[PDB]
From a paper:
A recently found family of pore-forming toxins, called CDC-like proteins (CDCLs), are wide-spread in gut microbes and are a prevalent means of antibacterial antagonism. Analysis of the CDCLs belonging to the phylum Bacteroidota revealed the presence of sets of two-component CDCLs, one long CDCL (CDCLL) with four domains and one short CDCL (CDCLS) lacking the fourth C-terminal domain, that act as a bicomponent complex via a mechanism only previously observed in the mammalian complement MAC. Unlike CDCs, the CDCLs require proteolytic activation with both components containing a proteolytically cleavable activation loop critical to the regulation of pore formation. Here, we present the crystal structure of a proteolytically activated CDCLL and cryo–electron microscopy (cryo-EM) structures of a prepore-like intermediate and the transmembrane pore.
(A) The cryo-EM map at 2.87-Å resolution of the membrane-inserted pore complex, from focused refinement with C30 symmetry, reveals a β barrel pore with an outer diameter of 260 Å, an inner diameter of 167 Å, and a height of 105 Å. We modeled 30 subunits of EaCDCLS into the map, allowing a complete visualization of the membrane pore complex. This revealed the complete unfurling of the α-HBs to form the membrane-inserted TMHs that make up the β barrel pore, which is primarily hydrophilic and neither strongly positively nor negatively charged in the interior. Each EaCDCLS contributes four β strands, at a tilt of ~20 Å to the membrane normal, to yield a β barrel pore composed of 120 β strands stabilized by an extensive network of hydrogen bonds. As in the prepore-like oligomer, the HTH forms an interior α barrel, creating the narrowest portion of the pore. Comparison of the EaCDCLS protomer from the pore with the structure from the prepore state reveals no substantial changes beyond the TMH unfurling and further straightening of the core D3 β sheet. In contrast, the EaCDCL pore contains only 30 subunits with a substantially smaller pore inner diameter of ~167 Å. A major difference between our pore structure and the PLY pore structure is the smooth exterior of the EaCDCL pore, revealing full visualization of the β strands in the β barrel pore. Comparison of the various structures of EaCDCLS presented here reveals that the only change in height is due to unfurling of the α-HBs into the TMHs, while the D1 remains in the same position. However, we were unable to unambiguously visualize the EaCDCLL molecule, even after trialing various workflows incorporating symmetry expansion of particles, signal subtraction, focused refinement, 2D/3D classification, and 3D variability analysis of smaller wedges of the complex to extract the asymmetrical features provided by EaCDCLL.
Author numbering:
A (entry chain C), B (entry chain D), C (entry chain B): 98 to 197, 211 to 290, 302 to 374
The structure:
Amino acid sequence: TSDQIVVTVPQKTFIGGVYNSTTLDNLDYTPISYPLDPITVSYSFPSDFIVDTIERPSLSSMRASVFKAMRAANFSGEQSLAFDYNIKQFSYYSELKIAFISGSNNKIKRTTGVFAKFTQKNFTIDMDLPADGNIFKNNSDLALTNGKNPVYISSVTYGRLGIISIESNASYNEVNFALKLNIDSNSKKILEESDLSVYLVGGRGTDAVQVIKGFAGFSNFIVNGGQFTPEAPGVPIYFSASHASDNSVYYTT
Amino acid sequence: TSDQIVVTVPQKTFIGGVYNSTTLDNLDYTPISYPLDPITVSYSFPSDFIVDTIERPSLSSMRASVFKAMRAANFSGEQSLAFDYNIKQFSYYSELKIAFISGSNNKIKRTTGVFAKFTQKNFTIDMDLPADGNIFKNNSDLALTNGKNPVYISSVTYGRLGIISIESNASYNEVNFALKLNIDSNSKKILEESDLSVYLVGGRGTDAVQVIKGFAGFSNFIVNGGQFTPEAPGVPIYFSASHASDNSVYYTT
Amino acid sequence: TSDQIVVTVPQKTFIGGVYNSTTLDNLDYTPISYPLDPITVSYSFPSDFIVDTIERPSLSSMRASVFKAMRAANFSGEQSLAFDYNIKQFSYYSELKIAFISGSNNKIKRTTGVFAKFTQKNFTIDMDLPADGNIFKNNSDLALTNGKNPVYISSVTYGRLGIISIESNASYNEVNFALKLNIDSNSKKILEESDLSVYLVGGRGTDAVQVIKGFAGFSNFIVNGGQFTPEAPGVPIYFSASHASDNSVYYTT
Ligand SMILES: [Ca+2]
Ligand SMILES: [Ca+2]
Ligand SMILES: [Ca+2]
């Protein structure tokens, strides 16, 4: 059970949207088309337009409200909300130098791997609890959707994601043999393999495209985007939903 | 099952278009010619014209709306949406130096290969869920197309694609023989093969045509187009569709 | 039993909110939708707007009040409230140099680990005890929620959190053998592993993203954010709640 759900359908992941719990669990996202009361939304970052109101919860309305809030006066993206980092570096080595009519066998093995995951939560837009205690305007739709598990998203997190994975393998198989008749034999085998997989969600495009240069771009893509600017608001990465019956926190498995 | 479908028919891949699920699965794209309510579209990038409305969903209307939105004020292509990178480098080696009336056999084998795939998602245009709960204007066309599996595209992703593949093979087959009668024999064979296949979708043309110079053009074509400009909006690369019955997310196999 | 509860649901963690004790204990946070009298809130930091009043306790109202209070005149973030630091450094070492037809065995083992936890409490917003002795406006809701364990949050702590953990392992397994017949044998094995996990809550984004450079960023992220500025108000990290029956301090297990 988790409180925050990773955004998988950006189109349907907007604040104030009502869905079925089962559909949200299996990534179907079947909406519940019923009227809803106007919702009050608040932003984690300090701004003049920190408390907005949306009559009809929709993706376009949420995007427009975020745009206006982050372009308003007294806006500061200087402080973020969360920053998780994790790196795992590993490096094996192997060397055999068997020697002995003559004979030699030199084997060298190398295996290097760096795996890095990073997430940053620039800010979140949160939804206020209804004054009437029910999100629905008619207040009878709650009884109408009995068995449909009405659950509405109440928080959307804007931030950046980044995953990198660099692997490398090296093999050396020198073999020498002499029978000084002057029979001679040599066998050299060098095998080199490399891999580098990157997955970035959001952030500055110029710094994002520089991660192709090994573990150097994925060292400035992070340090050049710590403060989120209104030109780079971030991407919805996580969201939280709550039950529509008792307004309790919805937990998914 | 996947949520995002790679664009194969750019003519028929426009937001607000209704097709049959089977036809979209087998790339037939048979349209459903029925009236539709005006659709609200939102853009992922920050701009003044971030929330547009289209009365008649069409490719020309979508293109014009994208053009106006990206030429509007307070537009920033500084932040992208996604960036996937993957590279695989491999290099074999083989060397035989058999020696022994005389005789020598020197065999050299080399095989190098670099495969790289990159995708960038500059932005997406998303469609709002209908207020009435049905995309059709008459609301009876939904029952009219029973058995036709009505599915409408609700999201179009603009970005760039790039695939490169460089292969190289080298062979050396020196053979010497002497019988010092002064019989002598020599056999030299050098075989070199090369291959380089590039496939780019979108991006700056000047940087795109420079990828012909090995793995150097496909190192600046990426780093010189991280920020998408209104002169280079990007190409529709992925799109998402939803069912017209329950407005649920459509998954294709 | 503890007096301060770590914030797990930022959406529901606002001052003046009434919840059930069991739901707050199991992180369900089921609200009690009943009218409440206007609440008086005070801020720990010195400011002109140090005593505010909120008619309807909500997250948006709390955020707006904090924004106005910290943007008011005579505001000083120079003095903080609490600062907890804890570091644990450990480093093992092992070295074997067994020697002996010949033979040698050199084994080297290293294991280093630094674990650091830091918390800073910039300020808190506290709630005054009701004049009537009951938070509810009607004064009968207290008897209405008998068995529901009415508990309301009365204090929210804004500050920063930081956890780092760096681990490293090194292994060396040199083995030599000679039988001077000139049989020779050598076996070298070097294994290096590294790990670095960081978790930051709040603080300056620019300093937060620099913690990726070992235990150097998590040495300036702390010293460059001691004084909290109105551009960096901090993040709600801890909160305290009290019973609604006798206005006593609520303790959770
Ligand atoms: Ca209502
Ligand atoms: Ca309709
Ligand atoms: Ca009272």
